[PDB]
Amino acid sequence: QVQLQQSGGGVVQPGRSLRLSCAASGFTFSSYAMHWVRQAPGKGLEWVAVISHGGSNKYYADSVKGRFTISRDNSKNTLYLQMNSLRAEDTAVYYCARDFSWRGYYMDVWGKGTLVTVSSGSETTLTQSPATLSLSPGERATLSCRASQSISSYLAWYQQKPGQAPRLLIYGASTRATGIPDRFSGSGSGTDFTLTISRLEPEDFAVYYCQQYGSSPRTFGGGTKVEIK
Amino acid sequence: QVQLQQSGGGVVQPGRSLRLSCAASGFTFSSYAMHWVRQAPGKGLEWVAVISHGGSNKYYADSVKGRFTISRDNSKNTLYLQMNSLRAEDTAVYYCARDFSWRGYYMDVWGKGTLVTVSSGSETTLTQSPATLSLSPGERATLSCRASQSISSYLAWYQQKPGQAPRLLIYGASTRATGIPDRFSGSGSGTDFTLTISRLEPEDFAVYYCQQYGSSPRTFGGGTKVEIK
Numbered sequence: 001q002v003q004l005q006q007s008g009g010g011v012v013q014p015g016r017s018l019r020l021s022c023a024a025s026g027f028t029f030s031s032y033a034m035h036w037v038r039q040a041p042g043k044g045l046e047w048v049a050v051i052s053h054g055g056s057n058k059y060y061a062d063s064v065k066g067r068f069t070i071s072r073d074n075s076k077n078t079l080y081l082q083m084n085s086l087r088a089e090d091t092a093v094y095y096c097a098r099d100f101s102w103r104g105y106y107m108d109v110w111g112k113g114t115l116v117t118v119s120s121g122s123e124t125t126l127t128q129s130p131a132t133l134s135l136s137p138g139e140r141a142t143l144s145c146r147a148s149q150s151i152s153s154y155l156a157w158y159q160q161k162p163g164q165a166p167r168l169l170i171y172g173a174s175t176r177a178t179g180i181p182d183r184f185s186g187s188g189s190g191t192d193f194t195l196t197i198s199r200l201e202p203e204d205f206a207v208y209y210c211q212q213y214g215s216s217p218r219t220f221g222g223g224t225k226v227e228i229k
Numbered sequence: 230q231v232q233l234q235q236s237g238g239g240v241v242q243p244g245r246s247l248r249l250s251c252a253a254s255g256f257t258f259s260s261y262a263m264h265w266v267r268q269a270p271g272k273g274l275e276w277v278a279v280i281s282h283g284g285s286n287k288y289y290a291d292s293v294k295g296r297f298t299i300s301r302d303n304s305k306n307t308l309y310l311q312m313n314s315l316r317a318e319d320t321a322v323y324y325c326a327r328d329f330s331w332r333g334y335y336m337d338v339w340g341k342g343t344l345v346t347v348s349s350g351s352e353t354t355l356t357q358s359p360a361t362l363s364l365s366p367g368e369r370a371t372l373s374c375r376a377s378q379s380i381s382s383y384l385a386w387y388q389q390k391p392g393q394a395p396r397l398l399i400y401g402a403s404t405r406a407t408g409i410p411d412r413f414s415g416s417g418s419g420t421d422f423t424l425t426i427s428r429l430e431p432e433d434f435a436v437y438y439c440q441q442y443g444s445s446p447r448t449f450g451g452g453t454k455v456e457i458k
Contacts, residue, residue: 015296015314037395037449044452045387045395045438061446066350067244085244085314095394105442106385108406110394121295156335158274165324165339166266166274177337209274213334217290220266223273 002026002109004096009114013121014086022079022096022111030054030074033099035107036081038092046092049081053102086118124149124212126221134229137200143208143224145193151214153189158209160223166209170195197226231255231338233325238343242350243315251308251325251340259283259303262328264336265310267321275321278310282331315347353378353441355450363458366429372437372453374422380443382418387438389452395438399424426455 008020022034036048049070050059058070069082079096093115097107125148135141145155157170168177170186173193183201187194197204205228210221237249251263265277278299279288287299298311308325322344326336354377364370374384386399397406399415402422412430416423426433434457439450 013295044436045389045449047440047447047449050447059446062352066242087316097395100397100400104447105383106397106400106440108397108400110396112394123291154334160274165341166326167339168329168335168337171329171335171337207273211276211335217288218276218279218333220274220276 002098004098004109004111006094006096006111006114009094009116011117011119012086014088014118016086018083018086018116020081020083020094020096020114020116024077024079024098027098027109029072029077031102033102033104034070034072034079035097035099035104036070036079037095037097037107038090039095039113040089040092048094050099050104051079052104059104083116088118088120090116091118092116123217124151124215124219126210126212126219128208128210128221128224130224131222132225132227134227135200136229137202139200141195141197141200141204141226143195143197143226145188145195145210145221147191147193147212147214149215150190151212154212154214155186155188155193156211156213157184157186157195158211159204160207160209161203162206169208200226231327233327233338233340235323235325235340235343238323238345240346240348241315243317243347245315247312247315247345249310249312249323249325249343249345253306253308253327256327256338258301258306260331262331262333263299263301263308264326264328264333265299265308266324266326266336267319268324268342269318269321277323279328279333280308281333288333312345317347317349319345320347321345352446353380353444353448355439355441355448357437357439357450357453359453360451361454361456363456364429365458366431368429370424370426370429370433370455372424372426372455374417374424374439374450376420376422376441376443378444379419380441383441383443384415384417384422385440385442386413386415386424387440388433389436389438390432391435398437429455 005023051070067085071080093113095113096111098109127146129144153173155173158166160166183198234252280299296314300309322342324342325340327338356375358373382402384402387395389395412427
């Protein structure tokens with residue numbers, strides 16, 4: 001009977017290349033259009049590529065275009081998919097499918113599928129609250145930075161004026177950098193950290209980021225925007 | 230004074246390579262650790278890479294590791310970032326930054342930044358309702374498929390039993406494929422489409438997908454799971 005045998009599935013790391021094979025028998029291979037359809041574990045079907053019966057016309061989905069290649073060998077009766085520059089999102093069960101005819105409209109014969117997994121290649125997460133803070137000039141800003149793991153006071157504070165590069169304010173969670181006025185003050189140890197800006201100047205209205213250096217890799221907080229009201 | 234001049238920013242397509250330069254003056258370049266930090270338009274700061282003063286030790290963030298490379302030329306007083314296999318998410322303003330010392334803990338001098346954009350290289354979206362449908366055997370299932378654009382009845386229906394490959398049920402939105410019993414019936418035209426499964430068999434409990442072929446590229450619907458209660 002009509003049959004499609006699949007091979008070439010396995011585990012690869014991101015960036016590398018994989019090639020899948022779909023061996024066909026029971027029908028005239030060179031007279032039908034051929035399809036690849038993928039399905040990530042859990043979610044629905046995603047259409048990948050189509051090739052014409054002669055192999056001259058090839059069409060791809062937007063997500064795979066430029067880095068995926070559909071090909072066929074009509075003397076070998078085999079369909080191929082070259083997968084290059086592989087992302088983590090490319091992790092799916094890949095089905096080869098024979099089209100109804102040469103048209104490439106819809107498929108009536110499906111291969112069993114081969115599993116393709118792209119993985120994989122500890123951190124200290126910093127959370128900043130609040131997200132935004134509305135205040136007047138003369139008012140005082142209080143900013144929280146919470147680490148997922150104890151950092152033993154190895155934390156830095158950065159100011160970023162809109163459109164400008166970041167500027168170091170506090171290093172070591174207490175020490176104030178050279179140039180920085182004493183209305184800015186860093187506080188805290190372990191997991192809990194605070195920046196206090198007493199008597200807000202118009203210059204002080206900016207985005208503020210905390211950065212840890214107790215563990216590798218170095219991470220930032222999500223930021224706190226201090227804006228006028 | 231202490232200065233960092235940045236260049237090499239621009240627009241590239243996904244997959245291609247870009248190299249950024251950070252030219253340094255006003256300090257002893259070969260005695261400080263060097264940082265790259267990126268910021269996607271709108272969101273916060275993301276730490277990319279660090280290089281030691283001698284250039285022997287290199288450390289990268291998880292998202293960029295394996296495809297990004299940090300390097301330096303101490304005779305040229307220049308820091309480099311080689312960006313390979315570029316994703317759409319890599320779109321950011323890239324800052325070079327001098328570390329406080331050779332340690333690589335935190336940075337006190339920041340470059341202006343260069344903008345890097347990765348873009349870009351019409352569709353008919355199919356929506357399926359409901360997501361799940363709980364029914365007994367003997368009951369009737371009614372399934373909706375809605376296209377974003379009129380497809381002039383060029384729609385196909387697929388059944389997928391759990392763990393198995395998809396199986397064509399209806400093509401052209403009315404016609405029933407060979408093998409398929411007449412308790413399954415497709416209906417509709419233009420944008421509105423329905424599959425009706427009268428008197429549900431135990432075999433019929435599966436996931437159902439609609440697929441359009443009026444426009445290129447070929448797209449699927451999100452699926453409807455028909456399950457027991």
